[PDB]
Amino acid sequence: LNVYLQKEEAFKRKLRYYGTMPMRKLTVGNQAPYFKALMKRGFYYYKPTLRWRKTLYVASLRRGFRKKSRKQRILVMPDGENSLITKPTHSYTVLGKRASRYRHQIYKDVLQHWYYTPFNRLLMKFDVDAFINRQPKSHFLTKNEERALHIRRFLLSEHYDTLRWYTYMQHYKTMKTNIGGTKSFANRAYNQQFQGTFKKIRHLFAITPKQGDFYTLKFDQPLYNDNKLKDNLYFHEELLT
């Protein structure tokens, strides 16, 4: 029993290879750290960091620096101690920089919301109605039906996984509990969403069912059968004889 348990531990350490792992030993002939480095950097991943905003635009010093020294303010007409440090009060005015940035953000929000108002999108509505009425009427689905189809797809994937040779492994339970039953992610259930920027549509659409009761954004479409299915759908009738 001790030998069996230690073999289980060794198998789990082997299974550790299929996820995130540290590679802290550089040795001759080992290409794993190079692969990790190329995966970390080598492709561009969009993110609005400081390096990106500095790249976009900093300022135009035509008349020199546009930001000047700060001027403390003091109350004229009437603190938890902490008198060790005197905090800056230059921003308490409404005419300052921070209030200008806040007003800029508020204006951007208000105008973005007003940009998509229903009475400013009539032609788009007409054209989309005309375009979407071309598809057969049975291809429209409710949200609950779409979620049920997603659940059916992944449960059927698990059921088909239950028929593989892995089930005959000595340590199959550990592999199923840790990995999930298959050694490749491509043999599982996933959505077809591989175009467009993730960070740009974060506040616009929903990409996962747990976000709420919304239609998820994806480029694939599960459907119900609209007729009694013929088993030899893709088979040529000449081959059936």
Binding site: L1, N2, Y44, Y57, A99, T174, T177, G196, T197
Partner: protein, 137 residues
């Protein structure tokens, strides 16, 4: 973005994007907001000299405090902004046949493989400790 050619005119399959995303170039309010300087009012005098007219104009509750939130409400309305609104141990037969005897379980353990493996390891450790202590006595 005066340092770059901030417009997309690609054709067919060819097209590349990095730090200038598709949404910023082609989609919705991002493209519209990124070109907000086209709609900024400017002061110009076609005939009269500039400095004199500028001086006269400068010769003539504030704007940002109240007018900013007043004009937006009056012109660009949106309800989101302006509306008030026992056998608890499940052992495989391989695990069962490795136990020295037939043992009784008196507790219900949470389902999962980790708890079963921990119980087996603790049993092995206890048996080894008992054997060693008995031998050394």
């Amino acid at each position: 973005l005066i340092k770059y050619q901030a417009f997309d005119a690609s054709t067919y399959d060819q097209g590349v994007y990095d730090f200038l995303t598709i949404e910023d170039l082609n989609y919705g309010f991002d493209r519209f907001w990124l070109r907000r300087k086209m709609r900024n009012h400017q002061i110009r005098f076609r005939l009269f000299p500039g400095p004199w007219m500028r001086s006269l104009k400068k010769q003539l509750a504030s704007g940002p405090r109240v007018e900013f939130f007043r004009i937006l409400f009056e012109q660009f309305y949106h309800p989101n902004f302006h509306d008030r609104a026992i056998e608890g141990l499940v052992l495989t037969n391989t695990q069962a046949t490795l136990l020295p005897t037939d043992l009784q379980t008196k507790r219900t353990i949470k389902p999962g493989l980790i708890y079963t493996n921990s119980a087996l390891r603790k049993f092995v450790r206890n048996v080894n400790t008992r054997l060693n202590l008995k031998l050394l006595n």
